[PDB]
Design a protein around this ligand. Structure first.
Ligand SMILES: [Zn+2]
Ligand SMILES: [Zn+2]
Lengths: 489, 522
């Protein structure tokens, strides 16, 4: 297929009209089109590179380039934001150094927290040229023609750098009449946009397919949750908050890549996009959310081996704007402290259900247990003396107590009136049971084994919406305490 | 007194409200009624001013609300919003608040012809030029001089061209728009949402709203997706409307449907999909296309979206999605008087925004196929047959006149099977008649012959702790008929869906479903 040299020669002889780019002898040629004409002489790019040709990328969209403006740093975005405000107000494209300086230098002092604003303008006045933003022709015309793009770009810059939006930002800059009601309204995707593949998302907004946690073309963080099986979404029960597992595939996860970015977002209290694919369903950007707590937990990697993993507790919010965030969220930060809450202690990989064992090492009896129940009590007492308890403190479930109930019940219903239940396991190899509190956490009940009970689907239904739910609750409360106390002597 | 009062009003204008406080609706400007009466005299009182022919007012509802009250009474009620939209465009571009009829006429009349689908645009402007006054949005200066139509609500063309009266927006409204662009963008978006939802190229300019709304028009609309409220009252405080299930319209005049989950084992969402099955309006007897249902039908015809509120069980309300009416059906259900009744089933498809460009192809295809006509499923089944009607039964029917139900299920199933382009509604909405049949067959018991055991206790709502479920999933082409369905307890259902021996069980259930079905035919 090197005969494409003949196709290139005809592109030269007749012109672009008649004939991702392909570079040959200092000239650019449409990759797909050259491949097609060569055929007569979607895996095209590979074919051309397999022949000895260097393939170059198309010029990055204005949205992408303004999105690439990231810290290694408020200088660049301040200038950019001024430039957008200028273009929207029909100011001239090119302006002299002299006016830009003493027009932006006050902004640079007040919003870019730099001392010498005059000097502050010098850096981005030059550095922004090698960011392919310094405005350009096509960019200036884009902003003058399509105000959505101006509003989007400014919203992107405002989201990442000035998420707290201090009063007098929109004017002082040129942007008050443009951003108006709400600044992040111009951001895309819209809440509820649906995509089949992860690739489809990528095509539309960029970033990469790799990783749960990553930034889209706009430079705003995005976290992706894929439901593995049915009866298992990220949502922590009795609430609308998410328990999002962290970034590292296969071994003990670290504050690198996605987890790192999450931590950077946690510290400053910046929101992020939360994507979600229900089981047998499509992806969708379903909510903005804010890091409210981070913890460490035992889980399994892709190598099926136990591992330390991060648990990012996310709180959904209507938009990035902090004024729009409900008070439960705003209370959960500041209470956060931004520090890792660790797992081990009360919590051995089994302990909990996803690691089968005999137990082959007879070190621990199944009736320890007692170790789990103790940790559950300790943790419970410590939560019980929280003056202002966040919804996370209240509803996130202690692994140790769940573990204890599992060790106690041994794949059976603990309801002594059980009509009967199957001993078949699930596809994933767990019993068809659920551990549930007799006295709901929502109504003050404690997160401890003697307040919990293992139930088959049928008995669980009885407990939850059965006609005699109340009497059953009494019975279950009794038998839970009983079963608990039987394992202490 | 009347001309005395006019002279008093004229001096209030000359000097200003501050200097009047230093020393009643007329202009489109409000005047302190006691104070105006007093200056009229010596240079209640209320009775005197109303005696002389002046409209005496309370503090008008918010501009948002009043523009939202602009509602219709192939159908021509685009006059008022066309004028209003022009006026907002004018105010944003710093034009004068009051403008002569002459200019407004031949500035708006082309807009009226192009966007208001009226023939004579020049004549089209007359109606809202006057009618908008009594909507508390407009004012016309020397009104008394005009001669009205025989009918009431149009000044005649001759009288308008003669006097050339300076008319416009109200005072405070004009200042609101001139000061706060969010309010302009909101009002315009409202009008564009209800009229012109299919936003044609390019009305934003022509109207002088391009710079304000070009990016996306509905961005200025509130509430935002995901706003959460405790009560229905909390919603009402923030956005108006009434505490009616709805449709109800909020203050902005945009339709809003509210779904409140009754117990824990249901939401509106039709299974296997994200589309909603929303029960109509009208609390108690056979529902009619009146109130909310009427509005839903108007929205269905033109393919206009609407706000869908939802409160999960033991949870809070939230505006969770925009949605579009994709199909409407008639079904048997129970009213608030606990009695069987004919009710509407509005099949909603969620969408990201009101803009049609943003809607996915499944939605577009389903709308394309709709026909907008009522599908009456009420003939296929009886209120007996629904699980919420407790009964002996008969003597109309033995319980093995289940045969009746199964027959209707077949007939419907065959008719769906021959659909060339089947919408996701056609495929996934579940036939009551077949469900009913399974319920009459199983009689409050698990049909899985290997059932480990299940309780005979009922739910709080008085239904057995079971579920009817297809052995061959509809999603995988299985038919919506009783011999393809099976009644399972929670345990057996879990076994079916994610048990380790799911596959073998499916074969067993398929077999026993056919068997049980065929036992009732002989
Ligand atoms: Zn049980
Ligand atoms: Zn069963």
């Amino acid at each position: 297929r090197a005969g494409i040299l003949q196709a290139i020669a005809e592109h030269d002889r007749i012109g672009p009209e008649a004939f991702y780019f392909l570079e040959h002898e200092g000239r650019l040629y449409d990759s797909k089109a050259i491949a097609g004409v060569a055929h007569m002489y979607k895996h095209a790019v590979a074919w051309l590179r397999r022949e000895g040709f260097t393939i170059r990328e198309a010029p990055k969209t204005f949205h992408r380039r303004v999105g690439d403006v990231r810290p290694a740093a408020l200088h660049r975005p301040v200038l950019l934001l001024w430039a957008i405000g200028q273009a929207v107000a029909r100011a001239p494209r090119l302006q002299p150094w002299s006016t830009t300086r003493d027009a932006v230098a006050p902004l640079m002092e007040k919003y870019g927290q730099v001392e010498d604003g005059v000097d502050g303008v010098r850096y981005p006045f030059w550095a922004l040229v090698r960011d392919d933003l310094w405005l350009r022709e096509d960019d200036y015309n884009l902003l003058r023609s399509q105000p959505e793009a101006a509003a989007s770009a400014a919203a992107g810059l405002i989201a990442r750098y000035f998420h707290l939006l201090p009063a007098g930002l929109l004017e002082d800059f040129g942007l008050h009449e443009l951003l108006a009601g709400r600044w992040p309204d111009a951001l895309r995707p819209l809440l509820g946009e649906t995509f089949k593949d992860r690739d489809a998302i990528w095509r539309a907004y960029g970033g990469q397919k790799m990783a749960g946690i990553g930034c889209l073309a706009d430079g705003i963080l995005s976290a992706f949750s894929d439901d593995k099986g049915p009866y298992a979404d990220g949502r922590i029960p009795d609430t609308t908050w998410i328990a999002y597992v962290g970034d590292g595939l296969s071994g003990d996860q670290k504050l690198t890549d996605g987890n790192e970015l999450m931590a950077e977002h946690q510290a400053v209290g910046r929101a992020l996009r939360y994507w979600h694919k229900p089981f047998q369903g499509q992806w969708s950007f379903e909510t903005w959310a804010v890091i409210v707590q981070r913890r460490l937990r035992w889980g399994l990697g892709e190598d099926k081996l136990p591992r330390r993993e991060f648990l990012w507790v996310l709180a959904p919010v209507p938009s990035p704007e902090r004024e729009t965030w409900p008070p439960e969220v705003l209370e959960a930060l500041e209470a956060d402290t931004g520090e890792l809450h660790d797992d081990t202690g009360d919590y051995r990989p089994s302990d909990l259900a996803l690691t089968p064992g005999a137990p082959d090492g007879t070190e621990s009896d199944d009736e320890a247990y007692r170790r789990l129940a103790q940790k559950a009590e300790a943790n419970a007492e410590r939560r019980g003396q929280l003056k202002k308890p966040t919804v996370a403190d209240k509803y996130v479930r202690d692994p140790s107590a769940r573990g204890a109930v599992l060790k106690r019940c041994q794949k059976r219903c603990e309801n002594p009136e059980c009509a009967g239940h199957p001993t078949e396991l699930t596809k994933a190899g767990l019993p068809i049971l659920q551990v549930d509190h007799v006295n709901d956490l929502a109504k003050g009940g404690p997160d401890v084994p003697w307040n919990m009970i293992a139930l088959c689907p049928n008995c669980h239904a009885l407990k939850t919406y059965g006609a005699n739910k109340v009497r059953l609750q009494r019975l279950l409360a009794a038998t839970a305490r009983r079963l608990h106390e039987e394992k202490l002597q």
